[PDB]
Amino acid sequence: QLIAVDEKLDITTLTGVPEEHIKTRKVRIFVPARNNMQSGVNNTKKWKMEFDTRERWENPLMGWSSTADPLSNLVLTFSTKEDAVAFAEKNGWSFDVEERKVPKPKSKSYGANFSWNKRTRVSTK
Amino acid sequence: LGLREIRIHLCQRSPGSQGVRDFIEKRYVELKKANPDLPILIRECSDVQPKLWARYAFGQEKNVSLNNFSADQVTRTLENVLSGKA
Amino acid sequence: LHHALIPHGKGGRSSVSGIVATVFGATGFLGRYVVNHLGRMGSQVIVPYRCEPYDTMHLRPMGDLGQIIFMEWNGKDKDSIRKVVEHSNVVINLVGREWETKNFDFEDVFVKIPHAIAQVSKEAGVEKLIHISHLNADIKSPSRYLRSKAVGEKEVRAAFPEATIIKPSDIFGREDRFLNYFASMRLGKETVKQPVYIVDVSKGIINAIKDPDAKGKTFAFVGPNRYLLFDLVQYIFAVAYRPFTTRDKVERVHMSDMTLPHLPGLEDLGIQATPLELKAIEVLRRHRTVKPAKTVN
Amino acid sequence: SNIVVSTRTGEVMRILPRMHEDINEEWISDKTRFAYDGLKRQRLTQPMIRNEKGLLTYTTWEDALSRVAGMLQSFQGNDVAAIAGGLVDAEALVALKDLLNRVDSDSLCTEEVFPTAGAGTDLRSNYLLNTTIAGVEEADVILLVGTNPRFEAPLFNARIRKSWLHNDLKVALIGSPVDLTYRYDHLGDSPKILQDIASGNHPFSQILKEAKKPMVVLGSSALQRSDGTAILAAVSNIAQNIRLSSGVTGDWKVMNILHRIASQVAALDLGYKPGVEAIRKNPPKVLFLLGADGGCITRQDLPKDCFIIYQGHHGDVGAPMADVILPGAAYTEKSATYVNTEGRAQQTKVAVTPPGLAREDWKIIRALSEIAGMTLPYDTLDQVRSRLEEVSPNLVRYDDVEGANYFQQANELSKLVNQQLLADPLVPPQLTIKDFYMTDSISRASQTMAKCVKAVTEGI
Amino acid sequence: GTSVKPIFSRDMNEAKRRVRELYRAWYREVPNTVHLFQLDISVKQGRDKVREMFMKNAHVTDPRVVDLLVIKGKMELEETINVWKQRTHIMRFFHETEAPRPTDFLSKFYVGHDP
Amino acid sequence: GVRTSPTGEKVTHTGQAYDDGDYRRVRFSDRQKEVNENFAIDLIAEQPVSEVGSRVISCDGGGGALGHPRVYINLDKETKTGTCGYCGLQFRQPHH
Amino acid sequence: TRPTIRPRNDVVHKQLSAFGQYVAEILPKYVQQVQVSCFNELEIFIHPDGVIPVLTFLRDHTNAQFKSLADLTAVDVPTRQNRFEIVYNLLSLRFNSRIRVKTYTDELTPIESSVTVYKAANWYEREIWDMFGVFFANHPDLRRILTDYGFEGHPFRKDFPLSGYVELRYDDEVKRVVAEPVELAQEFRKFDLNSPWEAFPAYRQPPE
Ligand SMILES: NC(=O)C1=CN([C@@H]2O[C@H](COP(=O)(O)OP(=O)(O)OC[C@H]3O[C@@H](n4cnc5c(N)ncnc54)[C@H](OP(=O)(O)O)[C@@H]3O)[C@@H](O)[C@H]2O)C=CC1
Numbered sequence A: 001q002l003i004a005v006d007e008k009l010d011i012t013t014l015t016g017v018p019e020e021h022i023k024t025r026k027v028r029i030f031v032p033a034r035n036n037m038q039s040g041v042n043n044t045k046k047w048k049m050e051f052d053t054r055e056r057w058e059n060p061l062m063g064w065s066s067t068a069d070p071l072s073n074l075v076l077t078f079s080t081k082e083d084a085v086a087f088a089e090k091n092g093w094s095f096d097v098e099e100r101k102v103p104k105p106k107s108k109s110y111g112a113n114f115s116w117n118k119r120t121r122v123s124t125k
Numbered sequence B: 001l002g003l004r005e006i007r008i009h010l011c012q013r014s015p016g017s018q019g020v021r022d023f024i025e026k027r028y029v030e031l032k033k034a035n036p037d038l039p040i041l042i043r044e045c046s047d048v049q050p051k052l053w054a055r056y057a058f059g060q061e062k063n064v065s066l067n068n069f070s071a072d073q074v075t076r077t078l079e080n081v082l083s084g085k086a
Numbered sequence C: 001l002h003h004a005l006i007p008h009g010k011g012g013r014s015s016v017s018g019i020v021a022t023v024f025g026a027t028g029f030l031g032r033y034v035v036n037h038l039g040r041m042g043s044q045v046i047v048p049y050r051c052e053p054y055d056t057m058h059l060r061p062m063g064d065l066g067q068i069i070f071m072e073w074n075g076k077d078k079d080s081i082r083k084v085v086e087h088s089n090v091v092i093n094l095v096g097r098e099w100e101t102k103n104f105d106f107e108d109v110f111v112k113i114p115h116a117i118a119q120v121s122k123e124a125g126v127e128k129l130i131h132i133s134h135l136n137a138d139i140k141s142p143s144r145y146l147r148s149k150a151v152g153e154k155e156v157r158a159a160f161p162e163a164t165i166i167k168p169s170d171i172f173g174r175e176d177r178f179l180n181y182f183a184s185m186r187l188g189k190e191t192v193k194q195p196v197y198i199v200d201v202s203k204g205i206i207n208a209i210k211d212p213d214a215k216g217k218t219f220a221f222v223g224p225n226r227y228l229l230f231d232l233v234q235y236i237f238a239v240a241y242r243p244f245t246t247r248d249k250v251e252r253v254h255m256s257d258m259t260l261p262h263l264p265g266l267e268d269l270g271i272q273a274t275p276l277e278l279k280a281i282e283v284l285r286r287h288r289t290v291k292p293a294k295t296v297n
Numbered sequence D: 001s002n003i004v005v006s007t008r009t010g011e012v013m014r015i016l017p018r019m020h021e022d023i024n025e026e027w028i029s030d031k032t033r034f035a036y037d038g039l040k041r042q043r044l045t046q047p048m049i050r051n052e053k054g055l056l057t058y059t060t061w062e063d064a065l066s067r068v069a070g071m072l073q074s075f076q077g078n079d080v081a082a083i084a085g086g087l088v089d090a091e092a093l094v095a096l097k098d099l100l101n102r103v104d105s106d107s108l109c110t111e112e113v114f115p116t117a118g119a120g121t122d123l124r125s126n127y128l129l130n131t132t133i134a135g136v137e138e139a140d141v142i143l144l145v146g147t148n149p150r151f152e153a154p155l156f157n158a159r160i161r162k163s164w165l166h167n168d169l170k171v172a173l174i175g176s177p178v179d180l181t182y183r184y185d186h187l188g189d190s191p192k193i194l195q196d197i198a199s200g201n202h203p204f205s206q207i208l209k210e211a212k213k214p215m216v217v218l219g220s221s222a223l224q225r226s227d228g229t230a231i232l233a234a235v236s237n238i239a240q241n242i243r244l245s246s247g248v249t250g251d252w253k254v255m256n257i258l259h260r261i262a263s264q265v266a267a268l269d270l271g272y273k274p275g276v277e278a279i280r281k282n283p284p285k286v287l288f289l290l291g292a293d294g295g296c297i298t299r300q301d302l303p304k305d306c307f308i309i310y311q312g313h314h315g316d317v318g319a320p321m322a323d324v325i326l327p328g329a330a331y332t333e334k335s336a337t338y339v340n341t342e343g344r345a346q347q348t349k350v351a352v353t354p355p356g357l358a359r360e361d362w363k364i365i366r367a368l369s370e371i372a373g374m375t376l377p378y379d380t381l382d383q384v385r386s387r388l389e390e391v392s393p394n395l396v397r398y399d400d401v402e403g404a405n406y407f408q409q410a411n412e413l414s415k416l417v418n419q420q421l422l423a424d425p426l427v428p429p430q431l432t433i434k435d436f437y438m439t440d441s442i443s444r445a446s447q448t449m450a451k452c453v454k455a456v457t458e459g460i
Numbered sequence E: 001g002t003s004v005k006p007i008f009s010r011d012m013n014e015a016k017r018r019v020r021e022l023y024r025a026w027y028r029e030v031p032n033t034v035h036l037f038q039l040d041i042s043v044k045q046g047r048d049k050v051r052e053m054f055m056k057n058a059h060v061t062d063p064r065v066v067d068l069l070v071i072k073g074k075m076e077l078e079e080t081i082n083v084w085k086q087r088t089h090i091m092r093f094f095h096e097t098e099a100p101r102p103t104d105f106l107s108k109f110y111v112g113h114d115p
Numbered sequence F: 001g002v003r004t005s006p007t008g009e010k011v012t013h014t015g016q017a018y019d020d021g022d023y024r025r026v027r028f029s030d031r032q033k034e035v036n037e038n039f040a041i042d043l044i045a046e047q048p049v050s051e052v053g054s055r056v057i058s059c060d061g062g063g064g065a066l067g068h069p070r071v072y073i074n075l076d077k078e079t080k081t082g083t084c085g086y087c088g089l090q091f092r093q094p095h096h
Numbered sequence G: 001t002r003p004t005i006r007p008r009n010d011v012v013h014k015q016l017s018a019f020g021q022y023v024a025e026i027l028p029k030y031v032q033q034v035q036v037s038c039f040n041e042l043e044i045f046i047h048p049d050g051v052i053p054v055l056t057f058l059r060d061h062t063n064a065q066f067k068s069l070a071d072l073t074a075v076d077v078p079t080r081q082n083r084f085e086i087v088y089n090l091l092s093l094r095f096n097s098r099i100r101v102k103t104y105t106d107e108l109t110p111i112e113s114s115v116t117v118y119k120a121a122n123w124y125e126r127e128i129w130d131m132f133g134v135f136f137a138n139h140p141d142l143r144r145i146l147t148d149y150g151f152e153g154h155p156f157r158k159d160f161p162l163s164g165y166v167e168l169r170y171d172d173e174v175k176r177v178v179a180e181p182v183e184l185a186q187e188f189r190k191f192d193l194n195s196p197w198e199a200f201p202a203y204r205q206p207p208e
């Protein structure tokens, strides 16, 4: 009732993806960086998978942005790094993993602004 | 036949590179005085066996493993490479 | 290379190939295939037509939006030819007619119009010109058709020294006159034919456009196999399951195809000519309601 | 510094900083932020050759590659040379090195000068910021020699200012009294002050002696002058005296060098010869200009009818004197490896594709190698990076900064030659803000940088 | 461990048995498909296409993937036999209108940035 | 303020016109090129500057709810005039 | 609350909680979790092996008799080891109540067909197979129902591109409609709309 087969998962032959969109692609597994224009951090909570950028050219009519790859807008969301790595592996995609960047904790002291002898004393407020 | 450069790749903390570390620290300076014009590139590996590369004329390259070699062993390897004898 | 003419994309419908081609005689048999091949790779095609637009309607889906432009013209006015070939870097001459009319005989169609087109293209700065003549064209031919073809070839070479001359031999295809003319009869043993496939000729024209060193060369587009006319007609009738054009066309079909060993052919353009046996059923299935003919080589 | 490139419909829109605590925290320099305007002007989009009139004309990739390959096959050995610019990635560098090695040419040079005496580039710590950018926050005394950190490395100077403000860091400088946005001690200007400190007469030697985490920084601008070997030897003597007197605090790595261009460290790791002295000593008949726009070598320094190939992305001082122009890709148009002044390897990503017929640099070199019959083993980017790992394995560790310290060996090897110091004041190339905006081909083609230069030159 | 629920095949032998049955059925069907759809290809080239489509998946070592592929191929055969497809669906296996993409490095370098 | 390119084509208010060597001009052969004859920049340049004796005033484009969002413009600077960021109307204090 | 806020119904909430406890007690072999949402919707999470027993019990039991299968579909969550969750929506006319049953599966594990319990499931399972690639065992005739003949891939998977891989046009040379790789004249514009400054504190996750 159970096969108990030892082999890594591979579903490339079942997904219907063309041959040249499997071996030549390079997905990036990363936590997106915070938009430095804003202080919110709610967009740096999950892991993202994105594909490598391909050619975009100008349409001779309308000058619009034309593309020839179907994976230019495909972005996946994952809870953990391991989930993204497993999904990339079982789909036969070569991947690059970037470790999550966390802002290190810092020491803040409002009283350090009005310092008696240190350089941290502010000239205005 | 003319040797062009030598590259030594040793890992910083692995025990397989202990002999190469000792060789460098003790006598790389003397080897460099002996060959002031020969570039000996020392680089660091990671979770890889120590290796030595020799580049010859017209881009010919050969590599030898220095794993678990003592300082004397990698030394003798370098005189073998420099003199051209096998 | 005029950045707007720098190729982009992956050679598809919405790509850019850097080719701006003016195809004279694009409303005919070879013209539809030429325009289809030009438009499937994303090139700008100017289609000049003297005929009613309804008869050019079938060329519209052969290219992406804005890539096929239609303009009226006539062969007796140089201004129309000029305004059609101003912005093109490739000019293709496919104008021809197998019979004479009260307004155009063989001379205007095969000498005057090609010469005017070549002169106007030279004056307009067109980079490449491809002119189509016949394989059996020569000055001393009994038929005025081939004499006019030879004179027009000479005048095109004189006006446009870097023109590419292509000389096919009895093109066969779905809308091709040659397969159809023989099967619509519902002589021989002394005349020899070497027909060529339509797709082969269209791809040869496209590759000559692509080829950089095929500027002032002359090509002869012929098929793989060479047939006696009696056996060829017998094979045609066998494929069609059937029991076995005033004066010029009968003379042309009664004379044997020439051999031009020194003239480069389709093999030099990286094309393997397709045998008639593979496409004969495709062409002649509609004439209905296996023993290929013997060849001489 | 880590950045974010904003693109829309295949066009670069703006540059945003990307947070990295160890390198740039949250900030980028003004040049980094606003020089992307130069990526849309003076661009090389098609291959070019010389016609019968001696002018540059457009040609196909095949013709230009064949013309270069014929000259490459005609000459071999010392007659073939290459110069690498300030914006070249490790992939193109290793590709060019392999291609010229197949020709038996070792004259692979960079425009930036580093003293080759003693260890040279053999020991990696001899030309690195061994303390790292984050390590500045732990130092108590820092000495800057012959450099202007404010303009040469704005984020390094920002880190120094932060340490000065928060850790009460003591700063001293030898050179021109430039404004660094913090107070420092101007020990003087003459290079003999280095010898005085190393001997022990200067009080700053004792100040360094009392320091628990001393740090000495020498800029490559000070190495660009003819006294580079002597200046490096003096700074190494100071560091060795510090180590001998204060003892071994641990893995502190007092010795440091601050680099100014993004391609120098990777080229030195790959075995490129720093400086252009080899070209002057042995003029070539075929010269490769891989993005070299420094003007170090002109046609006056080359023999008659020398063949010059320029590969790059901008039309600048290096382009008009070339015989064949190969349009390359900028840093925003390729996935390329760069190694910073710390020795940390980082990779860019493709934001937009190169314009026109421009191609990836290593792809151009590999295609040229195939045309000449000297086909290179690699075919994809992964194989190029495998070759990089074969040559220098640290080039594939994409966030590692740790490395072995070989200060003793380099210091001992630096005592062989005894070149004398000249009596010329240390003057950094960037003296005021006006010299900071225009440094490279991308910056020189930027209208925003021109506006900044105009504003600082005359103000309203 | 790595115990999984079977679909049809417990091991590889019976999975290959189903593969061979599907191949037999397709091989038998090729001439009827060629005649009934009035295709311009020959029976030999249709069987060559069937063989090529079967060989594209020769690397699979998972019996579950193998029997899912067999299920998909049997659906394909059911579509072909019942004439639910038209001639375009059958001819889509041959890519006659697609210009060939060269494989060598130089051609890809010349055409564009696509590796 | 429609200008004419040296080729002969009208230059639109965005300033674009096909170059002499541009093949894309062929689309206008036997046809015409749509150019809007009313240039907004000139039309707003013809509007006289309003004189108001107030330090801060508001502009909503006229028509009340049929205009643009109401914004307040400071008129302390005498070197230049205050301009609405939505409508382009200019305002100025009565100097002297 | 105020007239802009949807009112709550505690009686229906209690009734649904009691019936969820009842069903969970009767079938402890398959039921893994029972939930009642704030808008009074009851969900029962079961093991995949219990699809037929649980559905048969819910259809045939005197106190349940959910005689109507409202909808059957799948949801794709790539981050889970079991990629797909199967959702059954049932309606009871006798007690005027609705219930939801969820299970899970991956690309290679078949799910037992429920056509013997509900005849309506025949086309729903075909649609699930067509759009997600989930195989249903012992189905009367499982085949594509929505996509074109010969279509490769399962479009409703998250990693399937929006515009697909191939596009159709008429070719005059071959006198038929052909398929070619997709090439957009204008690429679809991807919009980054998700804002920082998290909106709903009640759903905040532990920072792990
Ligand atoms: N067996 C063959 O078909 C081979 C053809 N030849 C040559 O190859 C070329 C293409 O042949 P093919 O396509 O089969 O011939 P078609 O009759 O099918 O097409 C002839 C084209 O030329 C145009 N044309 C003809 N006469 C005039 C005219 N007086 N003014 C303007 N346009 C005109 C037609 O337009 P419209 O529809 O308005 O009449 C039409 O577009 C021709 O030059 C032909 O002579 C080469 C060897 C044999």
Ligand SMILES: [Zn+2]
Residues within 6 Å of the ligand: F059, F060, F061, F068, F084, F085, F086, F087, F088, F089
């Ligand atoms: Zn207003």
